Amino acid sequence: MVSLPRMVYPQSKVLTPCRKDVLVVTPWLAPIVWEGTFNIDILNEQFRLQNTTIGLTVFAIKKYVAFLKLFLETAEKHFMVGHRVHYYVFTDQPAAVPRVTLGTGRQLSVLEVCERRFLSEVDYLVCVDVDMEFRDHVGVEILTPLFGTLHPGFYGSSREAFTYERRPQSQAYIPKDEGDFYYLGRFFGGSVQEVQRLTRACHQAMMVDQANGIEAVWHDESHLNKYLLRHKPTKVLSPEYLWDQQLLGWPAVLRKLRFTAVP
Ligand SMILES: [Hg+2]
Ligand SMILES: [Hg+2]
Ligand SMILES: [Hg+2]
Ligand SMILES: [Hg+2]
Numbered sequence: 647m648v649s650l651p652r653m654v655y656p657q658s659k660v661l662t663p664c665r666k667d668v669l670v671v672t673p674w675l676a677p678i679v680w681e682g683t684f685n686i687d688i689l690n691e692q693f694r695l696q697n698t699t700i701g702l703t704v705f706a707i708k709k710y711v712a713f714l715k716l717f718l719e720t721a722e723k724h725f726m727v728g729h730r731v732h733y734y735v736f737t738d739q740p741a742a743v744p745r746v747t748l749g750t751g752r753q754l755s756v757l758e759v760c761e762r763r764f765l766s767e768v769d770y771l772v773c774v775d776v777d778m779e780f781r782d783h784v785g786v787e788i789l790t791p792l793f794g795t796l797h798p799g800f801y802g803s804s805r806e807a808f809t810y811e812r813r814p815q816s817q818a819y820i821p822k823d824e825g826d827f828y829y830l831g832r833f834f835g836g837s838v839q840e841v842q843r844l845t846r847a848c849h850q851a852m853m854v855d856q857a858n859g860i861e862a863v864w865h866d867e868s869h870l871n872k873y874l875l876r877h878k879p880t881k882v883l884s885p886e887y888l889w890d891q892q893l894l895g896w897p898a899v900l901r902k903l904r905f906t907a908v909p
Contacts, residue, residue, distance in 0.1 A: 650691050667899055672826065672882055678796075680884040681901040684787045690728060693786040699730040700789070701768035701838075706737045706776040707759070713777045713908065715744040722749055724780035724904070732768055764838045772835035774905070778888075782904040790881035792836035792844070794829035794874045798885040798894055803828070811868040816860050817851040818868040820875060829874050831867025833888045833905070836880070847873050 664670065664682050671677055702725065706714055718733065725731065733754040735743055740758045748754065764771060770789050800808055808828040811818035835841060848869040855862060862868035886900055890907040 648695050650688070650695070653687065653691070655685055655687065668884070672878070674878045676790075676878065676880050676882055678882045678884055679787055679887070681886060686783070686785060686787060689786050693729060693789065696769075697730070698770070698786065698789070699732060699768045700726045700786075701732045701734055701764060701771045702726075703734045703736070703771060703773050704776045705759075706735060708738065710776050711737055711739050711742045715746065716779050716908065717776050718744065718746040718754070720780040722746065722752070724782060725784050726786065729786065761842060764842070768838060770835060771838050771841040773833070773841065775832045777908055778905055779908055780905050782886075782902045784887065784904050788835070788881065788883055788887070790836060790879075792840040792874075792877070792879045793834060793881040793883060794827070794870070794879040795833040795883040795887050796885050797828045797830045798889045800828040801885050808871075809864060810871055811862040811864070813860065815858060816862050816868070817854050818862040818872040820872060825871075825875060826878075827882065829867075829871055829879075829882075830888055831864065831870045833883070834870060844870065844873050844877075 658664070665680055668680055669678055670680060670683050677683065702721065704714075704717065714735065721731075721733070727749070729751070731752040733752070734757060735754060736757045736759050737743060738759055740756050743756050746754070772788070805825040805828075806822050808820075808825055810820040810825060810828070812822075813819060834844070836844075848866060851869050851872070852862070852866070886902050886904050888905050889900065889903045891903060892907070892909055896903060
């Protein structure tokens with residue numbers, strides 16, 4: 647917890663919003679991360695002084711191993727560059743993992759398809775899908791105890807339109823008058839402790855649903871949304887962090903498209 651060094655950067659105007667087109671803070675005072683809200687130089691300093699290590703987990707089975715090359719190569723160019731990164735690739739085809747060149751301070755572990763390991767190797771965990779590619783900066787501005795990401799297909803929708811599980815018989819049930827945002831099941835993270843807490847809750851909830859003979863409409867995503875409704879995330883990432891340009895184009899509200907679906 648050392649002091650930051652002298653830094654020179656423009657002063658922020660208290661009587662001027664940084665973004666006048668979007669909500670940059672939630673009702674529970676968690677920032678909503680949009681381009682323009684953060685000074686990456688200040689944040690990089692803070693996390694480097696803590697010698698932060700970020701774990702990135704991807705789950706790639708069968709035909710999905712084909713997406714690993716692009717995923718890892720683009721992560722090397724845009725994900726936590728400058729910081730310690732540990733990639734965890736869970737796959738059923740260990741020998742199929744591409745030999746990707748990694749920058750210094752970055753490593754990759756192949757796990758064929760433990761929890762204690764995460765607590766000892768990384769400070770934060772980021773969980774995403776492999777059939778994606780990084781197109782712009784995704785850095786320490788996302789790090790926090792627990793974060794969710796706004797689904798690109800519902801950020802401007804009314805909660806009634808959110809595709810939450812609507813059947814009371816499911817543990818993921820959320821009535822029409824409840825809900826803050828519709829988060830992505832495929833891009834969340836936080837401290838190892840909070841991430842495992844969320845995954846453990848989701849695992850237990852899905853089992854209860856299975857015993858009751860019911861499956862949530864959007865499976866894991868439905869449960870993650872129930873969890874984040876009851877345990878507010880300490881940071882919320884804007885749709886800049888998970889977008890589909892083919893289906894949604896490039897709206898003016900999006901200054902950057904950082905992580906996207908592959909056509
Ligand atoms: Hg994970
Ligand atoms: Hg859950
Ligand atoms: Hg689960
Ligand atoms: Hg979950």
